[PDB]
């Protein structure tokens, strides 16, 4: 029995070696291996989310059309989670920037997503990720991106599909209320919206230490957007949270797992960050089956699944 809507994992590699670009597959970066989401999938988990760069996939401008390769390993990738019935989330991981300047244009970024949304317009277990982790940038660009990014989504036919909207201040869940109310005015004639935010547990919440603040931080850190969430009617989810393989971070996920479990009119799921091929010794890594996350933090997760 599924305690959530949704409970996965993060995929990432598409997205690796940033600085290079176009960048080159099998050296700078590497699409997610099928037979490992299909494990994953096994032990219960029914979303993965798709890291990539805007510019690989429509490189030069994002008004332009797809790289074929790029796109066809994408097309690869969602279909394989889908198949199986499994949610893919297409994540733009980009910061909300293009070439590393922030995208201005909602027009421009509207068009990159209806060319983006028309590759799986009639698919209903894709779920578009506007950007990954928005932040030092303009408080009503964020806003009108978010609206661009949905307005382009269903003109082109793309209707069924959640739309996963992220926040300023990297879509941290800490942070949201601070910074974010604006984000409640979206609109979506399929009145599909789910707010994505991100939590980790670290003392900065930059999830690059394995050392997580105490027993209850992570807790701590969802109730102000939880309770922000229902306050406005809206609904969200945890797109990226991770804690080290140690005691202190398993009792602080768990404990925010549960608090997400008695408060589901607002929370749809979680996704762990990450998994994916290219991370070895990585201290959250998810990927079966020697991932540090995969062997130490997956059992405290099934109780979820």
């Not at 959640?162 to 990297?170: H, K």
């Not at 608090?259 to 010794?281: F, H, K, L, R, S």
Request: proline share 5%.
């Amino acid at each position: 029995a599924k305690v959530f809507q949704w409970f996965g994992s993060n995929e990432s590699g598409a997205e690796f070696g940033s600085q290079n670009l176009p960048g080159v597959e099998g050296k700078d970066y590497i699409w997610p291996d099928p037979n490992t989401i299909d494990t994953l999938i096994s032990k219960g988990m029914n979303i993965f989310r798709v890291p990539f760069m805007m510019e690989r996939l429509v490189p030069n401008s994002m008004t332009g059309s797809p790289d074929p390769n790029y796109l066809a390993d994408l097309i690869a990738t969602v279909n394989a989670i889908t198949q199986k019935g499994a949610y893919a989330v297409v994540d733009p991981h980009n910061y909300g920037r293009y070439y590393n300047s922030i995208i201005s244009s909602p027009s421009d970024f509207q068009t990159f997503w209806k060319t983006v949304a028309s590759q799986f317009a009639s698919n209903p277990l894709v779920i578009f990720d506007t950007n990954n982790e928005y932040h030092d940038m303009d408080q009503t660009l964020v806003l009108n991106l978010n609206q661009a990014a949905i307005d382009g989504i269903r003109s082109a036919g793309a209707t069924s599909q959640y739309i996963f909207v992220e926040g300023n201040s990297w879509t941290g869940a800490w942070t949201w209320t601070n910074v974010n109310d604006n984000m409640k005015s979206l609109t979506d004639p399929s009145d599909k919206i789910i707010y994505e935010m991100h939590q980790f547990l670290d003392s900065d919440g930059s999830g690059t230490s394995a050392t997580c603040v105490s027993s209850t931080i992570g807790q701590e850190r969802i109730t102000s957007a939880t309770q922000w969430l229902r306050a406005n009617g809206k609904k969200g989810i945890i797109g990226e949270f991770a804690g080290g393989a140690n005691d202190v971070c398993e009792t602080a996920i768990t404990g925010m797992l549960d608090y997400m479990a008695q408060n589901t009119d607002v929370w749809t799921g979680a996704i762990w960050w990450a998994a994916g091929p290219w991370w070895g010794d990585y201290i959250f890594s998810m990927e079966p089956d020697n991932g540090i996350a995969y062997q130490q933090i997956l059992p405290i997760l099934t109780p979820y699944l």
